[PDB]
Amino acid sequence: CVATRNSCKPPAPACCDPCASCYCRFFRSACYCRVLSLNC
């Protein structure tokens, strides 16, 4: 589906997992697929 380097917005299409949302973790406001959680 998608890894964790694609920009998108919830809910759908989502990021494979329902815990994977399109968020930014950098100072570039680059919000992309990211769950930020192992137990999820």
How would you characterize the overall build of this protein?
This protein is mainly beta. It has a single domain, classed as Agouti domain (Agouti Related Protein, Chain A). It contains no helices and 2 strands. A two-stranded antiparallel sheet has the order 1-2. Strand 1 and strand 2 form a beta hairpin. The radius of gyration is 9 Å and the shape is globular.
**What gap, in angstroms, lies between the N and C termini?**
17 Å
Write down the CATH topology. Answer: Agouti Related Protein, Chain A
* Global Rg: 9 Å
* Proportion in β-strands: 15-25%
Secondary-structure element order, as H and E? EE
SS element count, helices: 0
Task: Give the CATH superfamily.
Answer: Agouti domain
- Percent of residues in helices: under 10%
CATH class: Few Secondary Structures
> Could you tell me the number of beta strands?
2
Structural class: mainly beta
CATH architecture: Irregular
| Spatial arrangement of strands, main beta sheet | 1-2
What can be said about the biggest beta sheet?
A: 2 strands, antiparallel
Identify the overall geometry. globular
- Tally of structural domains: 1
PDB class: signaling protein
Keywords: Melanocortin, inhibitor, cystine knot, GPCR, endogenous antagonist, inverse agonist, signaling protein
Assembly: monomeric
Entry title: NMR structure family of Human Agouti Signalling Protein (80-132: Q115Y, S124Y)
